[PDB]
Write a protein that binds this ligand. Structure first.
Ligand SMILES: O=C(NNS(=O)(=O)c1ccccc1F)c1cccc(I)c1
Ligand SMILES: [Zn+2]
Length: 270
């Protein structure tokens, strides 16, 4: 009765949550998704027909980042409404808290793809309100299940902050975050703050301007590392160069990242 399984690319993926595709679409065993234009279909037969006809081989919009075979496309919800709606319905299969699927005009979508000779294969995305009253640099962020915990979420988080830096703004993900989202942000913040502390020294305000991480997220991260003291109503960094190195040598920071090469990012504040 609900969509419980999708086929996209060469992946079949079980659903995690309800997503409000039309009811007739939920009645089948599977939904079949074109991995390039994200059209969803009811039957393997219409999917195969679509595959031989569809001419798209990458997301719409502008490629604002390209390094080697890693690419990010910026898609304006107002310019590519159907695609962005398709994207939000797919994302809702794996996000508990996302609530906006059809009114996509106030959002811009950053699509992460992995390119090979056949085309640019979607890995995940994050959305961003064009005008955030509460200073969120991410509204929702989603990595497709078979790509999770493989460095792609870390890339997208870093990417969202590289945009904030170009905007001369601090930003924060819209809350609530998933379990994995909490872990991923905490670990991204810890790495970024510890590398900055090793490289220089710095106030909490200094770190915020260098990283675009909000002062609250910095404070809560430093508290979980136990590197902040409290003095007459103010949080003050309290860290020795050696303790920073003992943290950075820890095994969790051992996997080599997909980095965001600032030189490969083509984007100006809107
Ligand atoms: O895939 C995930 N996160 N995994 S990670 O890219 O390996 C990673 C490693 C270190 C630090 C941060 C990271 F995100 C993942 C999946 C869905 C939503 C989100 I939000 C993240
Ligand atoms: Zn298509």
């Amino acid at each position: 009765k609900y969509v419980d399984k999708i086929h996209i690319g060469n992946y079949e993926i079980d659903a995690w949550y309800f997503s409000p595709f039309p009811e007739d679409y939920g009645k089948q065993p599977k939904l079949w998704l074109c991995e390039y234009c994200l059209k969803y279909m009811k039957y393997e037969k219409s999917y195969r027909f679509h595959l031989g006809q569809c001419q798209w081989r990458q997301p719409p919009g502008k490629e604002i980042y390209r390094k080697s075979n890693i690419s990010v496309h910026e898609v304006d919800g107002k310019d590519h409404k159907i695609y962005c709606q398709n994207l939000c319905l797919l994302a809702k299969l794996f996000l508990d808290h996302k609530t906006l699927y059809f009114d996509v005009e106030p959002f811009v979508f950053y699509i992460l793809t992995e390119v090979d000779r056949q085309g640019a294969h979607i890995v995940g995305y994050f959305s961003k309100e064009k005008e955030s009253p509460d200073g969120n640099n991410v509204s929702c962020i989603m990595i497709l299940p078979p790509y999770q915990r493989r460095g792609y979420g870390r890339f997208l988080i870093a990417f969202s902050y590289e945009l904030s830096k170009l905007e001369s703004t601090v930003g924060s993900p819209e809350k609530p975050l998933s379990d994995l989202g909490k872990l991923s942000y905490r670990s991204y913040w810890s790495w970024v703050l510890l590398e900055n502390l090793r490289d220089f020294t710095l106030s909490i305000k200094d770190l915020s301007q260098m990283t675009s991480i909000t002062q609250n997220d910095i404070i809560s991260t430093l508290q979980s590392l136990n590197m902040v003291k409290y003095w007459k109503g103010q949080h003050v960094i309290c860290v020795t160069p050696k303790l920073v190195e003992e943290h950075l040598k820890s095994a969790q920071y051992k996997k080599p990242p997909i980095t965001v090469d600032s030189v490969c990012l083509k984007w100006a504040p809107p």
